[PDB]
Amino acid sequence: CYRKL
Amino acid sequence: CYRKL
Amino acid sequence: CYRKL
Amino acid sequence: CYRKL
Amino acid sequence: CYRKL
Amino acid sequence: CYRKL
Amino acid sequence: QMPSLAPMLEKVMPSVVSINVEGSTQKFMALGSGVIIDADKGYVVTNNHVVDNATVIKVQLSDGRKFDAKMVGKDPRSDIALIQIQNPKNLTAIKMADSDALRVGDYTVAIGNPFGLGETVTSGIVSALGRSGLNAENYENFIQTDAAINRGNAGGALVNLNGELIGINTAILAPDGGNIGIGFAIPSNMVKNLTSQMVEYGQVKRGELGIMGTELNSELAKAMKVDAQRGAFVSQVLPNSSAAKAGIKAGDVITSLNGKPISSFAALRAQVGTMPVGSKLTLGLLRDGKQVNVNLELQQSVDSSSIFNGIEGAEMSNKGKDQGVVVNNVKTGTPAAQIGLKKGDVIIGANQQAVKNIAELRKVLDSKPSVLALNIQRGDSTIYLLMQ
Amino acid sequence: QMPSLAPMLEKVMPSVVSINVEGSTQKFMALGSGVIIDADKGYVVTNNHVVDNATVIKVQLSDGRKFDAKMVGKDPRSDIALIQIQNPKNLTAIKMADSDALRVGDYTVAIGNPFGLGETVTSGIVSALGRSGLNAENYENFIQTDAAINRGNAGGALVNLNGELIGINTAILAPDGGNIGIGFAIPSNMVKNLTSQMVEYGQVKRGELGIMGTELNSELAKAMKVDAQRGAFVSQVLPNSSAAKAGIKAGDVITSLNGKPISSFAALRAQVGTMPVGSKLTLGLLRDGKQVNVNLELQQSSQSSSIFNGIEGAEMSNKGKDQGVVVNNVKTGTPAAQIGLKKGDVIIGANQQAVKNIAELRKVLDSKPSVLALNIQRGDSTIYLLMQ
Amino acid sequence: QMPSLAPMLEKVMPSVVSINVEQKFMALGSGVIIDADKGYVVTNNHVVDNATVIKVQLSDGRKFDAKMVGKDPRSDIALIQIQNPKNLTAIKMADSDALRVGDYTVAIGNPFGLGETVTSGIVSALGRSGLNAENYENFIQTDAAINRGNAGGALVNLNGELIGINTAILAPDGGNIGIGFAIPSNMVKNLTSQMVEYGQVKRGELGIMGTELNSELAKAMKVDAQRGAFVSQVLPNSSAAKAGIKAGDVITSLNGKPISSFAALRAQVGTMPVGSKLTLGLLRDGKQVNVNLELQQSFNGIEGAEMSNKGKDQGVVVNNVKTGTPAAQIGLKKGDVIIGANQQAVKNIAELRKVLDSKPSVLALNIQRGDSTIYLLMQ
């Protein structure tokens, strides 16, 4: 999925 | 409970 | 199916 | 559960 | 009592 | 039960 | 003359404790184990899922002494908590070790309290490193060990052959609920960091970089003509962020962190989310063939699901010069949807309470009223709206 | 040229056997394992519960040599059997070790016939010492091991790295009938003490201290201002007792046994519950924090399957001077209910043979005629009972 | 200073992989590289059978693609070949016969797909079998943790040398209970290398029939050993017969190595290739008989009948047909002489080959049953 960092 | 040696 | 312990 | 074997 | 992997 | 070998 | 672990466990085992915890909600008792970090202060690290929703918490040392101990901090996004002891007297602390030196092959000795039997020791090896994904949400950089671990081992110590703490055991993988050769442990360097945030702050200062990404497979490196197969592909570089300030390129792959290679994104993602808001770390890159290493710093990130308490439906903040709470959120079908909270409407507040900011609301909401009725006004229409 | 258990297991593995019993309650057959104690006599030790209800017992050697074996006795209170090999030739006996030298963290190797496969070896470590409290009736002082142990490892060997017997593998804690890393084994000194009586007498002389007591927890330790958090608390001392003679008063906390620290009351019970009558021993105890030592010996305890070899419902009490086969305990619905007689009264007059002593029974009770005729004197009257 | 396996594993993990296979199912598993240049990976047949596509993923991330090379469901070894292989690492073989119970073992695989996982243990026992009756098994047993997906994995000794391939475990709950089995290296060596030279496992058998030797037979027939291999009948005209093994014999050693059970020897030699020579240790009348043997199978011929030439250019002769064979179903009998086939006058088996090598859907044979002239039809 979309991944945030 | 209570035991006896 | 991962168990945590 | 304890198992005797 | 029969299994495989 | 005899098996060839 | 034999080899043995007894000389090491003879001096470390007093630094592992049993944990019996009582909640009030539905009320339950739960079992577990912990690790004494600080002798004098009494800081005992444990798992978050072990200690949440708990009225009474009692700690039982390796000795047999029962203590009391209330919470010092928690963090369910990585499953680490901290507690400290009532009347800490003559304790023993564990020695931390650098989890970043561990290799797939080192021998591990686990400690904990399975099935409330007491302090049991197990031997094994580091099965593999940087394990993530068994629960996609939280930060996972799990050390995998074949050391045996069962129910109640959580918060238990995983220590190398010198007795230095390399991990806190947090999970297993058991289709029948019994150890089948897979244990999972959170590295001590992530643990030392969150034990270090719960002491000074009381909570965790959720750090923020300013990038986005996704796990670099072996397919992307084939077409992107990238040399490495495992890394972190920086899709999105967020603007005005401390990350972008370092010149982080779009389309890079982070492969280094303190000169130490990186297993996975969800590991690097996990490795970073366990840090204080004002730390400084280096990243090795790979733009077009040049491994440009750049320093960096993290920048800030006030959650409102803690004001909901079961009726969470959408995101509410603060407006202007405290004219009111905020409703930019537009959610349909949520727990806060049947009660008709639509967009562009905050007011004063409930039960004759002047509410113009998020804090002024929290002042009186948490007086626990039987029924609470907002005052929200849409356009010119002053309406009301009731809960509980 | 790497480290290995193979050179030690070359010599010790023959001393481990597999046993296969057939019997009645039915029809059933089950399997276990055994350890050769006396080579020249044919003395195999095993678990009592694999030996209950035994018509024919056939050991099998490691090399495939089959044999036959009659019982030498049993001990249902510690789950230790012992058996005698019929026509034994060229056996090997395993060396013992002192269980009082075991420390947590030492290395262990488990040998047995799990799952009817054959002589299977597993390794582990001493997970913990002196675990008990799985069934109140039995004297247990178990050793916890992570060495894999499964059904058929019964009465197996558990040994240190010099091939010296430390334990007889007894039970596993495993919810799902398969080892999850917890194994329990009776220590060597216990097995050594019990078997020793089982050779001379075919029974265990139970010698008592004459003390009542209970587990000392850290909350009772707060009560009595005692600086010990585990130990043995003294409820009351019986009159004309070996302990009462020694100077044991109510309100003392037993802290050591022959100088060795005490893990629990359950261990103190099980440890001296096995020693033969008149065994010298030292105890350390705590009366108002003045650490007092005392010495004593055991005295006699005073106040069916021992002979039947199949039905443990009744209990053959002491013969008496003139009397015999008196009984003082039976359960309703036992195999001692099909027989006709009851606990309240019993004597002897079997098959028109003037008989009174339990030894005079078996000289005809082993004759096994087609039909048996008891002759108790229930009440003041004469009666008879028939069988087979 | 603490000892560790990380030095040994650093050199060996490159040689294990994870494999994925794809009404239609999708499979997990593990394999191990045998030949770096050609990219040969070995694994268990029960992960790579019924495989539309075979996707190998090395230790470093690099996914590749593999095709089948051989298979052998009877022992459960199957071999793949990696397509377009660059920079591969071959694991070093070990001689299983040097294993002893009590040795230390390391199990590398891909359990539950999680990733390349390492687990330690000892040699629980050797020569185990009897779990799959109709199967060749000489299993190594290890208490090294092994679960679903670890199959086809690596069992290496403390020096990283391949001693066996992890295969099956006994576990009522579906999780390892401390009883894990593995196929010995030496068997894998014999099975793999056969799949490269011949594509299949050609495993002819010497001609002993017989059954296990139990301690009860030791008493009845004055036999010094309690575990071995008892010979019922020898097949006639087989190597076992030619070598002079008789009924009532007991087999105690294979090539100087002792035998555990008849079911093990039945597996050790089931993996040997056709014509392998060997020496058995026998026991007749309590005296040591040492034998030497050579295995045997289970143009100039045809499916059922044997054809040789006769005379100059006259035609080939069917010299014997076994009843029930295909060539006896088509009607060919003893003595028939083939002068033409499909309007093509035939002489030698070479003019018959090119005609037959056309692989036509029909065969009209202009034979000569005795003095008469007939046609025979096949296919």
Side-chain angles (χ1 to χ4, degrees), chain H residues 347-356 361 373-376 383-384:
Chain H
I347 60 135
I348 314 90
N351 275 327
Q352 224 189 267
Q353 311 304 326
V355 174
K356 61 224 159 302
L361 274 311
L374 261 68
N375 183 2
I376 88 164
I383 81 159
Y384 253 73

Side-chain angles (χ1 to χ4, degrees), chain G residues 39 81 93 145 213 223 244 270:
Chain G
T145 176

Side-chain angles (χ1 to χ4, degrees), chain G residues 100-211:
Chain G
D100 304 352
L102 270 175
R103 328 162 68 181
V104 186
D106 296 311
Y107 287 84
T108 88
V109 184
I111 317 178
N113 188 1
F115 307 111
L117 308 153
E119 205 196 341
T120 74
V121 186
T122 326
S123 91
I125 75 181
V126 151
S127 277
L129 250 52
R131 277 306 158 72
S132 314
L134 52 142
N135 294 258
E137 309 191 270
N138 47 299
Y139 304 115
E140 298 194 331
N141 187 35
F142 291 175
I143 305 178
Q144 186 174 353
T145 176
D146 77 336
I149 288 178
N150 286 276
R151 166 168 68 96
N153 263 121
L158 188 97
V159 285
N160 71 2
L161 304 167
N162 302 333
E164 299 168 67
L165 182 79
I166 66 173
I168 301 305
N169 318 291
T170 69
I172 80 190
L173 195 169
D176 65 305
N179 183 261
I180 55 161
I182 289 159
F184 289 142
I186 280 177
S188 78
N189 286 133
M190 289 174 33
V191 170
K192 186 175 184 167
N193 284 11
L194 271 42
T195 63
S196 291
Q197 291 197 60
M198 297 181 186
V199 284
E200 292 210 62
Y201 281 53
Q203 40 185 312
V204 185
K205 216 68 215 179
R206 272 283 158 246
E208 183 87 328
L209 209 70
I211 81 179

Side-chain angles (χ1 to χ4, degrees), chain H residues 17-23 29-34 44 46 50-51 54-62 64-71 83-86 113, chain I residues 214-217 219:
Chain H
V17 316
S18 35
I19 59 194
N20 299 307
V21 294
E22 331 207 22
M29 76 296 263
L31 84 153
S33 303
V44 163
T46 166
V50 78
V51 152
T55 44
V56 292
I57 306 175
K58 35 153 49 177
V59 171
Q60 160 157 318
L61 261 302
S62 70
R65 270 195 286 167
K66 256 178 174 178
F67 286 89
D68 305 322
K70 284 166 196 157
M71 206 154 329
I83 48 183
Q84 186 85 281
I85 298 204
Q86 297 295 282
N113 184 334
Chain I
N214 50 80
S215 196
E216 308 179 7
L217 260 170
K219 269 148 36 60

Side-chain angles (χ1 to χ4, degrees), chain I residues 67-296:
Chain I
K67 313 214 57 192
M68 212 94 69
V69 171
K71 34 182 41 182
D72 176 79
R74 276 309 122 202
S75 64
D76 210 6
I77 275 75
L79 194 82
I80 62 184
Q81 163 163 13
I82 297 186
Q83 301 309 118
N84 303 336
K86 292 196 213 73
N87 213 98
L88 289 185
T89 328
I91 201 170
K92 184 187 186 261
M93 300 295 279
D95 196 298
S96 304
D97 321 318
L99 261 176
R100 323 161 82 176
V101 185
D103 278 322
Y104 287 116
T105 56
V106 153
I108 309 175
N110 188 272
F112 298 139
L114 313 186
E116 175 134 301
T117 311
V118 190
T119 37
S120 55
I122 77 194
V123 172
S124 266
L126 302 169
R128 285 321 157 71
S129 34
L131 312 85
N132 196 308
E134 61 172 17
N135 248 2
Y136 305 100
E137 31 196 14
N138 194 40
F139 281 9
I140 305 165
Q141 190 180 326
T142 191
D143 67 325
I146 280 183
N147 285 293
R148 263 185 224 103
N150 209 325
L155 194 95
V156 309
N157 64 19
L158 298 178
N159 292 347
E161 313 174 50
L162 176 69
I163 58 193
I165 298 272
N166 311 321
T167 319
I169 89 164
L170 151 62
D173 43 277
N176 172 73
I177 72 181
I179 298 168
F181 304 119
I183 299 166
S185 154
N186 282 357
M187 286 189 24
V188 183
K189 189 174 279 154
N190 287 358
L191 298 162
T192 54
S193 64
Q194 223 177 113
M195 304 175 164
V196 189
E197 295 157 312
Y198 318 93
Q200 59 201 8
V201 181
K202 310 184 329 174
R203 55 140 80 84
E205 302 235 13
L206 40 67
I208 66 173
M209 290 255 257
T211 206
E212 284 275 5
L213 171 131
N214 50 80
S215 196
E216 308 179 7
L217 260 170
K219 269 148 36 60
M221 304 222 57
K222 289 76 183 292
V223 200
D224 295 60
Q226 286 78 2
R227 261 182 294 90
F230 185 87
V231 199
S232 169
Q233 74 204 242
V234 311
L235 262 279
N237 210 253
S238 106
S239 53
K242 303 182 224 187
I245 314 149
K246 290 184 256 169
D249 280 325
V250 175
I251 316 175
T252 74
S253 46
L254 166 57
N255 277 302
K257 307 258 170 190
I259 177 185
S260 71
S261 63
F262 178 102
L265 171 54
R266 173 253 214 278
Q268 299 162 59
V269 79
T271 69
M272 296 179 114
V274 171
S276 322
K277 96 292 192 202
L278 42 74
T279 58
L280 303 172
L282 252 52
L283 218 73
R284 66 179 56 160
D285 298 25
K287 292 206 191 60
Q288 251 296 353
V289 164
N290 272 350
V291 87
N292 267 86
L293 266 155
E294 151 171 327
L295 304 197
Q296 292 183 169

Side-chain angles (χ1 to χ4, degrees), chain G residues 2-7 9 58 63-64 66 115 117-123 150 176 178-179, chain H residues 103-107 125 127-128 131 144 146 160-162 173 176 180 182 217-219 229-230:
Chain G
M2 299 207 329
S4 176
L5 311 175
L9 292 153
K58 286 197 139 198
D63 197 342
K66 296 169 229 206
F115 307 111
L117 308 153
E119 205 196 341
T120 74
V121 186
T122 326
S123 91
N150 286 276
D176 65 305
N179 183 261
Chain H
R103 228 188 322 162
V104 174
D106 298 313
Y107 284 82
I125 58 168
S127 266
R131 257 52 184 293
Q144 191 159 329
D146 64 344
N160 81 307
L161 295 182
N162 309 333
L173 159 60
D176 207 287
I180 59 159
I182 297 186
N217 56 50
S218 177
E219 305 173 334
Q229 280 60 254
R230 278 146 319 129

Side-chain angles (χ1 to χ4, degrees), chain H residues 130-171:
Chain H
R131 257 52 184 293
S132 35
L134 276 287
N135 65 105
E137 325 279 352
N138 279 251
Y139 305 66
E140 38 184 42
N141 191 19
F142 292 0
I143 299 161
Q144 191 159 329
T145 173
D146 64 344
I149 289 192
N150 288 267
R151 187 216 199 88
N153 215 277
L158 182 103
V159 285
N160 81 307
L161 295 182
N162 309 333
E164 314 181 21
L165 185 67
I166 56 171
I168 296 309
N169 301 308
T170 325

